[PDB]
Amino acid sequence: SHAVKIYDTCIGCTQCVRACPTDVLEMVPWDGCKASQIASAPRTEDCVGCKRCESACPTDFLSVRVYLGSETTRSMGLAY
Amino acid sequence: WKPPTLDPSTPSPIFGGSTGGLLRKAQIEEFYVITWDAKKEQVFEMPTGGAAIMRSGPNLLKLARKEQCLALLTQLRNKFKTDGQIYRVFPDGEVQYLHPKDGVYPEKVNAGRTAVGAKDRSIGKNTNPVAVKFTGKLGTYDV
Amino acid sequence: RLWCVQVKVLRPESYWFNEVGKVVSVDQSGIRYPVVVRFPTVNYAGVSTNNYSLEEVQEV
Amino acid sequence: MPLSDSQIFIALFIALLTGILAVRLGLELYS
Amino acid sequence: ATKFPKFSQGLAKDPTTRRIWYGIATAHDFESHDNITEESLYQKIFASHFGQLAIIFLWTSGNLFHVAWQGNFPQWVQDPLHVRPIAHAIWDPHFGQPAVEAFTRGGAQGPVNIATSGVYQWWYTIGLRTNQDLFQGSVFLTILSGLFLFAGWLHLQPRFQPALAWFKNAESRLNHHLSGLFGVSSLAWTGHLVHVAIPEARGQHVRWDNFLTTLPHPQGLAPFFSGNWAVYAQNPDSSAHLFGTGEGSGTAILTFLGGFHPQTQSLWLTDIAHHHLAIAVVFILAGHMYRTNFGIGHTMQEILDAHTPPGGGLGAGHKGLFDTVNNSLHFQLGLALASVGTITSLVAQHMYSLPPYAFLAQDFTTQASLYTHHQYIAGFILCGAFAHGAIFFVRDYDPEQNKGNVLARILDHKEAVISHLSWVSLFLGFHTLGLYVHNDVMQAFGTPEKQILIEPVFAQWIQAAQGKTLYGFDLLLSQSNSAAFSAGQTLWLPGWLDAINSNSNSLFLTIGPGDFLVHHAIALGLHTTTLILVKGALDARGSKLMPDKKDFGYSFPCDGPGRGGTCDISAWDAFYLAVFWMLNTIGWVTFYFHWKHLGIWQGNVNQFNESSTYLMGWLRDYLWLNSSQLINGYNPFGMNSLSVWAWMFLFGHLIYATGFMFLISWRGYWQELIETLAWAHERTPLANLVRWRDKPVALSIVQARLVGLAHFSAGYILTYAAFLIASTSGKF
Amino acid sequence: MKNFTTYLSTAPVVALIWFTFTAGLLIEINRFFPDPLVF
Amino acid sequence: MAAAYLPSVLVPLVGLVFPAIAMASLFLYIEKE
Amino acid sequence: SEYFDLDDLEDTTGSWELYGQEDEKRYPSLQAEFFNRAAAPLTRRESLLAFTFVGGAGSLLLWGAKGSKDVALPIQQGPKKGGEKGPRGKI
Amino acid sequence: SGLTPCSESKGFAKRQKNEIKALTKRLKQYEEGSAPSLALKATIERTEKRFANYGNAGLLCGTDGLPHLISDPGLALRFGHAGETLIPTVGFLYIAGWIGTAGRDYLIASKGEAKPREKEYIIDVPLALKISAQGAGWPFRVIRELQKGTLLEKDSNITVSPR
Numbered sequence A: 001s002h003a004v005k006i007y008d009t010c011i012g013c014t015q016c017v018r019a020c021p022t023d024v025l026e027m028v029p030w031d032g033c034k035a036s037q038i039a040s041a042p043r044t045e046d047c048v049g050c051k052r053c054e055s056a057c058p059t060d061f062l063s064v065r066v067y068l069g070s071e072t073t074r075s076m077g078l079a080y
Numbered sequence B: 001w002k003p004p005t006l007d008p009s010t011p012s013p014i015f016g017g018s019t020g021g022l023l024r025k026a027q028i029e030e031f032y033v034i035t036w037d038a039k040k041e042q043v044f045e046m047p048t049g050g051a052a053i054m055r056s057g058p059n060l061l062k063l064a065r066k067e068q069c070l071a072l073l074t075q076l077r078n079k080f081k082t083d084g085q086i087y088r089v090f091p092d093g094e095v096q097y098l099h100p101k102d103g104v105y106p107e108k109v110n111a112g113r114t115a116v117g118a119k120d121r122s123i124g125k126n127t128n129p130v131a132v133k134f135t136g137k138l139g140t141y142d143v
Numbered sequence C: 001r002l003w004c005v006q007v008k009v010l011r012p013e014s015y016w017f018n019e020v021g022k023v024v025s026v027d028q029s030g031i032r033y034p035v036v037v038r039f040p041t042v043n044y045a046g047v048s049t050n051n052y053s054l055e056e057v058q059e060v
Numbered sequence D: 001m002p003l004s005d006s007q008i009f010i011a012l013f014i015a016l017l018t019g020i021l022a023v024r025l026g027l028e029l030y031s
Numbered sequence E: 001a002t003k004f005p006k007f008s009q010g011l012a013k014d015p016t017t018r019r020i021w022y023g024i025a026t027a028h029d030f031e032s033h034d035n036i037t038e039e040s041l042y043q044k045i046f047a048s049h050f051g052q053l054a055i056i057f058l059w060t061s062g063n064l065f066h067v068a069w070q071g072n073f074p075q076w077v078q079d080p081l082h083v084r085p086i087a088h089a090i091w092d093p094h095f096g097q098p099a100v101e102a103f104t105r106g107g108a109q110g111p112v113n114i115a116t117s118g119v120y121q122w123w124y125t126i127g128l129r130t131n132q133d134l135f136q137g138s139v140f141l142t143i144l145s146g147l148f149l150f151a152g153w154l155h156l157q158p159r160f161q162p163a164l165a166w167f168k169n170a171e172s173r174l175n176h177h178l179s180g181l182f183g184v185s186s187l188a189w190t191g192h193l194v195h196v197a198i199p200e201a202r203g204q205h206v207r208w209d210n211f212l213t214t215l216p217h218p219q220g221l222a223p224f225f226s227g228n229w230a231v232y233a234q235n236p237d238s239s240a241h242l243f244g245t246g247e248g249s250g251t252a253i254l255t256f257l258g259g260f261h262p263q264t265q266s267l268w269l270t271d272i273a274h275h276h277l278a279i280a281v282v283f284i285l286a287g288h289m290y291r292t293n294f295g296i297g298h299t300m301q302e303i304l305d306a307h308t309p310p311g312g313g314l315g316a317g318h319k320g321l322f323d324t325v326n327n328s329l330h331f332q333l334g335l336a337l338a339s340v341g342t343i344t345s346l347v348a349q350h351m352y353s354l355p356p357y358a359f360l361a362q363d364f365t366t367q368a369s370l371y372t373h374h375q376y377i378a379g380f381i382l383c384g385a386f387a388h389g390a391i392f393f394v395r396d397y398d399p400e401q402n403k404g405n406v407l408a409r410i411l412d413h414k415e416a417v418i419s420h421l422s423w424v425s426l427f428l429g430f431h432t433l434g435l436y437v438h439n440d441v442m443q444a445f446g447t448p449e450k451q452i453l454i455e456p457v458f459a460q461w462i463q464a465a466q467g468k469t470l471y472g473f474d475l476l477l478s479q480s481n482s483a484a485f486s487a488g489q490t491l492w493l494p495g496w497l498d499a500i501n502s503n504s505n506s507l508f509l510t511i512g513p514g515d516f517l518v519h520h521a522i523a524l525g526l527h528t529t530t531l532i533l534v535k536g537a538l539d540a541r542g543s544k545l546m547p548d549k550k551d552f553g554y555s556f557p558c559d560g561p562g563r564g565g566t567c568d569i570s571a572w573d574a575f576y577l578a579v580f581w582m583l584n585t586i587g588w589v590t591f592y593f594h595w596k597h598l599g600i601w602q603g604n605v606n607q608f609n610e611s612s613t614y615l616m617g618w619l620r621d622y623l624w625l626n627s628s629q630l631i632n633g634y635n636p637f638g639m640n641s642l643s644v645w646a647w648m649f650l651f652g653h654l655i656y657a658t659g660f661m662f663l664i665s666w667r668g669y670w671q672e673l674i675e676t677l678a679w680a681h682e683r684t685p686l687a688n689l690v691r692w693r694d695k696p697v698a699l700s701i702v703q704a705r706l707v708g709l710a711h712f713s714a715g716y717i718l719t720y721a722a723f724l725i726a727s728t729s730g731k732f
Numbered sequence F: 001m002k003n004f005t006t007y008l009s010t011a012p013v014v015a016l017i018w019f020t021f022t023a024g025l026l027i028e029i030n031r032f033f034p035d036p037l038v039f
Numbered sequence G: 001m002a003a004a005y006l007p008s009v010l011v012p013l014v015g016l017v018f019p020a021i022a023m024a025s026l027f028l029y030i031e032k033e
Numbered sequence H: 001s002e003y004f005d006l007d008d009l010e011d012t013t014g015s016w017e018l019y020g021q022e023d024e025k026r027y028p029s030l031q032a033e034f035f036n037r038a039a040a041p042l043t044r045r046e047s048l049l050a051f052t053f054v055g056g057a058g059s060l061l062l063w064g065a066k067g068s069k070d071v072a073l074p075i076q077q078g079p080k081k082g083g084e085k086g087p088r089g090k091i
Numbered sequence I: 001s002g003l004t005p006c007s008e009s010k011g012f013a014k015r016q017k018n019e020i021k022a023l024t025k026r027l028k029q030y031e032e033g034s035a036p037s038l039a040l041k042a043t044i045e046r047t048e049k050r051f052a053n054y055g056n057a058g059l060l061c062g063t064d065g066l067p068h069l070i071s072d073p074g075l076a077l078r079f080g081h082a083g084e085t086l087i088p089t090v091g092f093l094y095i096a097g098w099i100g101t102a103g104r105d106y107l108i109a110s111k112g113e114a115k116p117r118e119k120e121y122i123i124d125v126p127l128a129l130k131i132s133a134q135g136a137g138w139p140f141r142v143i144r145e146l147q148k149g150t151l152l153e154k155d156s157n158i159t160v161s162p163r
Ligand code: CLA
Pocket: D025, D026, D027, D029, D030, E004, E005, E006, E007, E023, E024, E025, E027, E028, E044, E048, E049, E051, E052, E055, G029
């Protein structure tokens, strides 16, 4: 499966969670930013690796990072 | 809130069929079910291609991929203002509830969730790949 | 630190490393990256603002 | 002057021994 | 899941056909394998090196065996200018009878391939004469291969496994390799030349059964031990010597004549013996430099730590670089590939102009094939050198351990280096293409006197300084009263000046404006290939577009369509892009070599001199004109022996074109297509009785770049090899 | 007229005018002084 | 050439028999669970 | 309703036999008995691979040594025109 | 380089004669005074003038019968070939420095505007013409900037990627 690690520059904008087409990401409470929330990646077994989340992220550099890993049926996006 | 149970007596939308639906993977690996409650009978676009008619009341749709279920759910939420539930169904009969995982949509922050994958540093503070040689770790992001 | 004072970015992975931006605001609640900086140039994502820590900016 | 049949068979036999040693090295490198 | 990629559980659990492909493609990347340690990595590499050496010796044994068994080596030895050398026999059951007749050549009793590798000239020069000699050499090399395989197996056994510290003992390895592997091997080769090759060139049959009976020099070893070494240079072979016979032969064994044997048009064997003897002494001396276990010799870490300019111009200098080089196999491989590939180019440049083998210069097909072969090999090796430099920067480079030294400092001004490479590439391309296009328009409009033809006066001045008097620059070796002239006048200058002032050889060919233009094209190619490779290596760890690129490794598809889009951002992709430019550059180099030599061999130098100044001249008078015999290898009227080259010519064009499919069309089109195909098989009666084990998927993004590049390169090489060999051998 | 001259100051119009001037100058130099190879 | 029948035996062996064995065995190895 | 959790997962996942029919009586008894004893030694995967290997290799070398000569393949007749002539007086 | 002056090269003369002969062969299919006859005669006149001018410039000719240019500044100055490459080098470098200095001046002047990007695609044509005229004195100004230290931006003010 792909690894999705979150860093602490996240401003809690939730855009990566909304962008995700397979529901890998979710917002959890945090105290490190003004929005009082941070992205989390609890379901990377469903991550296809499209990097829509990284395209959505506004921080410089990225606060969500996708590291493509070992390929599975789910990560290859196969319906057969 | 508790995870809902998949009601197998739910009717399916009115559809004439297609070549884009389930394949052998549903028999031997897994498939997915999306359920939703429609306010009225109306036409929606199938994620596998073609127009279908959602029945008034509860609807059930079996799909090959989780991404297909979430694409249909995005359409239901943005075009029909309708919520839905997604399950994973295994060949042995096991049904796993998937989405929304804790009853609240993931884009809305909810108490009781715990961060996984969080790194307490900015991305430029990752170490060098030479420092993880012969350790078994996936990379500098893994440490 | 001040409002609308020029600062130099010291974050190496930032698009605006060694460049000078303008402080928009500084959060006073103890968040990790409280300094909001606006820049005259867009980065590769089209963004012109970014948040920094105190040690990541130098007043110029 | 051409080679004899025996010379060709000698070369083929020595090559077969070398190939056996090669299979041995390849299996040792594998596991 | 499966057990084929047993070194990678991540690949073994892949349920798709990608598992097989990636399992093949990652098999020799031992560092990334599961549970590998540094010591086991080095031991596996050591054994793999034994396997490669055994393969090389078996390959040489096979060439010797097939020439001995199916070739015409004694007949060629009898008439080296009028016998086509045979590589091996053809047994092809698809042959028609006209193909059987056409390929029967060289006096063979059946269809054969005519060799282009020059092994006949080499083996004849070093003293081999009969099929029995070649057979004995082949059997010896097969035994050597078996010994290497046994040693590879042996040093994998636990009590013979070398420790990791043994592999990192740099000083002892350098001492031994310089003194023994280079120096003693060169000394033993001088022994072979003096005892065997030189007497066989003088008609004396010296073999294992009589070499202890045969005197190599009439005065024995007394002049050597007494130091009266000029005895061995007295009485060289005369200018009327016939090679392989005693007629006109001398008795000298170590000379410095310079130039060429008049009959063989190759270097004197006694000069070669003296070369290898001096090389042996220099290398044995250089192998006593580094400290091992006897309290004397240099320590390389301290040498490197000492070489820092006191003015601070290089920062910390070379401090810490010993551990940087010694701990990184990729730094070592990059250095080895850069040096070996440059040496391969040097071999190509020196073997055409200073042919070392008898009757090689008259074999035009062989000379062209050898130059082209070694230059393409050199290009691939240089690409690999820079690739492993980039891999070092990603995987092995520790910035803290290299703080302030030359490596960190060149990383610290990488933008300056890359931008200046970009500037020189742009200048060369703009002006070389512009001058060519201007000349093309001048020729098209009927006014060739309006061409811009810049005389290469700098290289002509170099040729004059080395003794070529054609250009009128009177200096050094072309000035008869200069000190440089008078110093060499009794030793090597007469033969050298006879050779360099003759236009009947390849020694410092006459050059003009066409040589100017193509040399600047070569400079453009070298600088652009270097720009791509260097930018790939220096941006391998990160750039502004992807500041954390080191976290993703050497090879990865992209970083997605965000931030403007990031296709081909990895350092691997810079290698992939640079291979195209390397192939282009070696193409220009070899086109130049072949066309200039075609004019020289056909006795018409004016064709190159007049037509090479514009690109239509290259197209029409080189590619179009010389393809005529090749494409008529088979036609409606019949076929001849060039039909194999016509077929391979088209074969290479086809493979080249097929590569464009992988390079132009990208993945997601094929994945959706394969999805429809997977639907079709599951729904088709009598066919859905069978099922795949691995789920069929489209090839990956990186794999597609690789496969497209491989088809492109293979088609490139096959096409040019067919054209080169057919065009040269149909005339000569 | 201000809007029209602003359009004439857009990059491709300025490029067209400048390159027409430069190309015309080169053409007329080569018409008046045909075949210049050297200075 | 001496032993001139050998190409007519070894060419089918190296070109047909050995590749068939090799791909059959390698297929069996790389599909083994 | 096209879904059911248990005892109808085959219909839910479409695991249907479109054309296969259960049938025990197709072939005559003596014909079947003949063909089971004919193909009995090849019902082991190692024996069939050994049989096909030995037969195919023997057929291929017998073709190469003898059969290619019998059908008069051009590679077995060899040349008869004396050899192609090369340029520059080379043979 | 062993070359010969084009005015005494036999190949040069043969090329002139052959080109004139081809043009004259084309001429004898048109009436005198016709437009093709006048055009061909003008081409012939230009060809004769071109060969005379190339001979009179002291150009060296190869064995091809074609002019070859000398580009070493030493060989050009001592043997009268400075008009082939050296003087064109000075002329090109002057015009190129003019173009670059005018572009730099326009960019620097636009940097101080409220909308600096607007002047990059909507050209301030009077300002551009004024700056273009002032580019004639570029070497003096550029050398002064080099000695003063204002030509180059300092390394601490320029973005770089992480090393
Ligand atoms: C100079 C030539 C050379 C050398 C010294 C090696 C050396 C090695 N290879 Mg590499 N190989 C080569 C050429 C070479 N290979 C070529 C041309 C290819 C195709 C591109 C490969 C593809 C390859 C694969 C896919 C694997 C190796 C593996 C190995 C190791 C064990 C080899 C063995 O005999 O296992 C003997 C084992 C068996 C006979 C049963 C298992 C079958 C294995 C898994 C596949 C066959 C491997 C064999 C080398 C293929 C030969 C290719 C042929 C066209 C020349 C050893 C380090 C294996 C290793 O585990 O990685 C470190 C491994 O999986 N090789």
